[PDB]
């Protein structure tokens, strides 16, 4: 409970480097990448377009390991 995840603040297109305006922190369920990791995610890539409001899960980010 009460753990925050990275949520897509805009549609994040494929093969596009993640920027800070693309990511917000929100308490959603299920839990995705912890909000704490929003600096680590900067400049990484998604392997599929993420719609607005989707929680970013580990598998969506190319090269992500926690």
Query: DSSP strand (E) fraction?
Result: 15-25%
First-residue to last-residue Cα separation = 20 Å
Strand order of the largest sheet: 1-2
The biggest beta sheet is recorded as: 2 strands, antiparallel
Number of domains: 1
SSE topology string: EEHEE
Give the gist of this structure.
6% of the residues lie in helices and 18% in strands. By secondary structure, it is mainly β.
Keywords:
monomer; 66 residues; mainly beta; Type Iii Antifreeze Protein Isoform Hplc 12; secreted; Antifreeze_III; AFP_Neu5c_C_sf; Type-3 ice-structuring protein HPLC 12; AFP_Neu5c_C
Helices and strands in order:
Layout lengths: L4 E4 L14 E4 L11 H4 L3 E2 L14 E2 L4
Antiparallel strand pairs: 1-2, 3-4
Could you explain the architecture of this structure?
This protein is mainly β. It has a single domain (1-66), classed as Type Iii Antifreeze Protein Isoform Hplc 12. The protein contains one helix and four strands; from the N terminus they run ββαββ. The strands form two sheets. It has a two-stranded antiparallel ribbon with strand order 1-2. It has a two-stranded antiparallel ribbon with strand order 3-4.
């Amino acid at each position: 409970a009460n753990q925050a995840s990275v949520v897509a603040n805009q549609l994040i297109p494929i093969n596009t480097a993640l920027t800070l305006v693309m990511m917000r922190s929100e308490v959603v369920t299920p839990v995705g990448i912890p909000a704490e990791d929003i600096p680590r995610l900067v400049s990484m890539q998604v392997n599929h377009a993420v719609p607005l409001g989707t929680t970013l899960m580990p598998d969506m980010v190319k090269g992500y390991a926690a």
